[PDB]
């Protein structure tokens, strides 16, 4: 489907040799992106703005300039913006063109992801150029380079694994799988790829990369979440004992019990945590499996509803 | 804290014989609402949106300030969803307010402001979260009405059952119009206090306007989950990608049923090596990132 894209890589290949781990870039000419559905409303800044009926983001240094210490904004006053040097950046654009919500659903099956996966487009737009600092995300991206050039560095994250969170060159979670010394902040020893007009770059989950560019750029980028195993699990886990209603009551600051009281706790704790044991102990990977629908990102839930009703 | 609120009632006697299952109604002068940080700059319809910077949320679609005060002769409701943002003097006061309520640290807690007027509010539902309410101006209709379908509830469910509400449902539903149900007819200075999981719907013949303070209701489930997730969260092969196994060939799908048991296997034993201490030092975990998130988007709106 994206195969028209990616050619002459195949699809299998893309899912066997790449994903979900390594990046792959694929050069070609702008015109065969209309392959996409809804490729059109989204070919110029204009085309987008037409379109997008929800607020805008607007980045630059002319904000902390009109801020005196990022923001969001309507549509209309979006081209002053860009026109003052200010990246806009076009969140849920699926929202407002059906065709290419209808296609990233068709891609999400292809990849095999969790039914219950976030998925949404974005374009991003910026008249000087700009760029963004070292960092790696947990979500993965295609991203499609419509108009200018932008050069990305790209760089094998050898410090975790598979991460479950954004960082920026550590959080609570992310210490616990952590390993070795961070790279520098130029990433010097990183792939170095410079992403023209019909060039397609697959940004695999926890890649480093950054950006600089100075040119007028617009690109469609297109963001999956990544659920991981623990996701489903623990909601599968949490369908098992949502029932009983012991697991239901309100919990309790520790802190404010009395000494007297909290000892009794720990006694009715204890004998739920026998009851989440066994009920682990007999989970099976149907349960896993069927749990592929739930929410894994509220995150990008509440964002969604929340554009939907501005809209 | 809120002694002086709802005096005579005790706050010994509001956590035993109320808290968290039992609706509270107090009476008296709205002067009483005076101490609560911010009243002034809310006290009023006017006064809440000279200070209220964001969208509001008509009843459901959001809309300008502006937009709102046409939806209201219009008989629609006006949800002014954290106003706390724009009276971070209530911020403290709710703050001691959780921690006299002895709920978790990382329970959700905001101020909403309400107004209505001709004559709405909203038809009959059941909310997971809980709400001390305080009438200012206006007298606003509430139906009442215990909960006897299920005990305590983890999603909001209106008259209208979901997958996971479905798993702990008992008997028949209320009639829509909600009779075999205690009117009240809250004015000002009454404060209701309004348990999670029971029955309610609003109507404002003339117009109303009142101070809700929602707090969040985290479940044991809650916590315990939270827990298990530190746990778990450090070892990779919990961290691999899920799949959608329909997708999958038949041999490939084995491959992840072992894959699986090996998780569940090492799942089970974490399980089973959980103290309750782990359990009570994950109470500041995001038991509703639904509401953060929301705090957030609104701040870039401001
Ligand atoms: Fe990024
Ligand atoms: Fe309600």
New interface residues.
Partial sequence: VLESIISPVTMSEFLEEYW?VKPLVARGEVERFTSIPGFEKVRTLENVLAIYNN?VMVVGDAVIEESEG???VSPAEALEWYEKGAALEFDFTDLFIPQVRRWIEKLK?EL????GTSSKAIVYAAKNGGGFKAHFDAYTNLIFQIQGEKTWKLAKNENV????QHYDLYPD?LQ??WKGDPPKEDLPDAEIVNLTPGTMLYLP?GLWHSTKSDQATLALNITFG?????????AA???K???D??????????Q??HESSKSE??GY??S??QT??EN??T???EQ??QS?DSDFD??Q???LV?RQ??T
């Fill in positions: 979900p607020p990022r923001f969001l099956a095999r992801l969790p039914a694994s598979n991460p479950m979670d616990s799988y989950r990544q659920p991981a195993w623990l996701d489903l699990m623990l886990l949490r369908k004992l949502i029932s209603n012991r697991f239901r009551e309100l919990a309790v600051n520790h404010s019990l706790l720990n704790l204890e739920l945590i989440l044991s682990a102990e989970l099976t990977p896993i499996f592929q509220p995150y839930s509440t964002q929340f009703l501005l």
